[PDB]
Write a protein that binds this ligand. Structure first.
Ligand SMILES: CNCc1cccc(Cl)c1
Lengths: 172, 172
């Protein structure tokens, strides 16, 4: 049985997530701007749907036939605790709990980012402990368990260097 | 978590243990093979075993791990401390699970009576199972945290509840 973690894939300047054998999601700003193929498939044959910082790829053949299709939703109810599935180039896996809030345009460092706001639940500092996000983590998925079903509801877009606030980019 | 801490995490019996120094190895009592008379090629004869419930410390009369520096072992940590549990999973994947620590507790978990420092996972809200939580093969994994300039070890993994949200650290 393939774990959720096998779906998290290094991509461009960050990461993305296999929803099904043909559907891959990522953060718009990590996608290469010079490319003729992705994952060995010509761009000719890839449908790209971009909505702000959320991008969905639909391939015309099965790239990951080992996977079953997962539920993808447009964000989650306010107050849902998601996990952000962060992979690091050390080989570390860092699932971090995030309390999700409203859809909003928020001021994060310099910039306006639109998506579902969240607050990390790992406490005061990261302190140099594995407890917060870094810039290279963009495109990591937000997931939660609902009855028996895993749900993916967006991708990591931005975070304040001051610890607390993250933005999850969502579909549509 | 730093490479030197992962280097100390050792496959042992039905779980793990942890090298505090070149001569001192800690583990959870229930993962030790019951018939074993030799450890790291040394007879029992040559080892000082200190057992307190589900905490076991092995002190060797020679240096088994001379590559290592001795580090600090404490008797649990203050309430509110966020620790990492250093868990190794199928394929050089490294899972430093975030846990908020609480009080010393006595519990009944699936007809075992367990005594140690309780904690709650900070990985997600319904953490049951291998992607966001602990599995029985994780017993003996160390609980560590960073204090100013230093890292500390403060116990080893002993148990988790049926729900997976509560864990117990065995302490010296
Ligand atoms: C059920 N939601 C989790 C949570 C996290 C942090 C604070 C509160 Cl009020 C609730």
């Amino acid at each position: 049985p393939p774990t959720l973690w096998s779906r998290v894939t290094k991509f461009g300047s960050g990461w993305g997530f296999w929803v099904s054998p043909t559907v891959f999601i990522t953060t718009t700003h990590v996608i290469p701007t010079s490319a003729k193929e992705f994952f060995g498939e010509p761009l000719t044959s890839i449908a790209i749907h971009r909505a702000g910082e959320f991008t969905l790829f639909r391939f015309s053949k099965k790239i990951r036939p080992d996977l079953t299709g997962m539920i993808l939703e447009e964000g989650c109810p306010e107050g849902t605790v998601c996990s952000v599935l962060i992979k690091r180039d050390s080989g570390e896996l860092l699932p971090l709990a995030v309390r999700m809030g409203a859809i909003a345009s928020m001021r994060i460092q310099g910039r306006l980012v639109h998506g579902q706001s969240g607050m990390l639940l790992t406490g005061a500092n990261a302190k140099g402990m594995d407890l917060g996000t870094i810039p290279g983590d963009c495109g990591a998925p937000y997931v939660y368990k609902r009855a028996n079903d895993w749900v993916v509801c967006g991708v990591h877009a931005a975070a304040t260097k001051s610890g607390n606030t993250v933005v999850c980019a969502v579909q549509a």
